[PDB]
Amino acid sequence: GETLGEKWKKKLNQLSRKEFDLYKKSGITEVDRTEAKEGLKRGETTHHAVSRGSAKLQWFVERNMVIPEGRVIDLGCGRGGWSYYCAGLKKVTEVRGYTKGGPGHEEPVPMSTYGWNIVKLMSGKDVFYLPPEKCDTLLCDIGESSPSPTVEESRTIRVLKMVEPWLKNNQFCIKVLNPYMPTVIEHLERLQRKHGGMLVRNPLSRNSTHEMYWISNGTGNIVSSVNMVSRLLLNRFTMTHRRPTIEKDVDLGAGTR
Numbered sequence: 487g488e489t490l491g492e493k494w495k496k497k498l499n500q501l502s503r504k505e506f507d508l509y510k511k512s513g514i515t516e517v518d519r520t521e522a523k524e525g526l527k528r529g530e531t532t533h534h535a536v537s538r539g540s541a542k543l544q545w546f547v548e549r550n551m552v553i554p555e556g557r558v559i560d561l562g563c564g565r566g567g568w569s570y571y572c573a574g575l576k577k578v579t580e581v582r583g584y585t586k587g588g589p590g591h592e593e594p595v596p597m598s599t600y601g602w603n604i605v606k607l608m609s610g611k612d613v614f615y616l617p618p619e620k621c622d623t624l625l626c627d628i629g630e631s632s633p634s635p636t637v638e639e640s641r642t643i644r645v646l647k648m649v650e651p652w653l654k655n656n657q658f659c660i661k662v663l664n665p666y667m668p669t670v671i672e673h674l675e676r677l678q679r680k681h682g683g684m685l686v687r688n689p690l691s692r693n694s695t696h697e698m699y700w701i702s703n704g705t706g707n708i709v710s711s712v713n714m715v716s717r718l719l720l721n722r723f724t725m726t727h728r729r730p731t732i733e734k735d736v737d738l739g740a741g742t743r
């Protein structure tokens with residue numbers, strides 16, 4: 487090839503575990519989960535986001551990169567961070583989340599946070615087998631990291647192919663697990679011409695993944711954005727651990743819509 491991303495990946499795989507754990511959060515942003523974790527351990531059902539995902543999606547929404555509305559589909563919902571977040575938003579009328587669950591996979595967590603009544607989370611659902619449904623907002627956070635970039639290329643292309651029939655001039659935010667492999671870039675470019683949007687790096691993502699998100703509201707050069715991330719992540723190998731920038735987690739409140 488060999489792409490910058492592929493060079494990054496080789497370096498990452500060389501790291502000792504100790505080096506890996508220091509590198510993965512070096513200079514990133516993260517929300518302080520202390521209060522939420524404690525609440526959730528005690529079975530508290532209000533205010534707390536169930537995962538770091540609520541803040542991650544919030545970052546895109548507060549920047550208008552995706553603007554959830556009407557019927558929201560959340561593919562690979564896990565515990566439900568994206569779903570519960572969207573459920574509290576003014577333009578949102580219904581949230582449908584699908585996730586695999588079972589061994590190796592997070593189950594949805596029931597909560598009584600704001601707007602929980604327009605929300606249904608369904609486990610036991612492999613979205614590769616789901617036929618597309620009409621939706622006003624399509625979200626997808628699927629993509630499992632692997633030491634092998636060709637395994638990740640395969641997973642990423644599977645996701646891109648799976649999501650396309652759900653895209654019908656709607657709002658969207660889709661995880662692209664490995665955006666640097668050449669075949670992925672071709673698919674993304676084709677998809678961009680057809681459905682628009684842009685690839686964006688979220689500052690809350692760990693340095694241990696090259697994930698970027700395809701969001702509906704933006705434009706830009708995919709190849710440039712991907713290389714920018716590869717250079718960033720590579721540069722973060724060169725210095726001692728920079729402690730992450732710590733921000734407040736989201737308060738999702740209580741009550742119905």
Ligand SMILES: N[C@@H](CCSC[C@H]1O[C@@H](n2cnc3c(NCc4cccc(Cl)c4)ncnc32)[C@H](O)[C@@H]1O)C(=O)O
Nearest residue numbers: 537539562564566567568585586591612613627644648
């Ligand atoms: N955003 C969330 C955090 C969510 S993190 C991502 C979540 O997605 C779930 N998951 C993984 N593969 C899945 C699959 N098909 C398999 C598959 C694999 C690759 C490509 C395709 Cl098309 C299909 N079908 C359904 N769920 C899957 C996984 O258990 C995790 O909870 C939060 O805020 O909390």
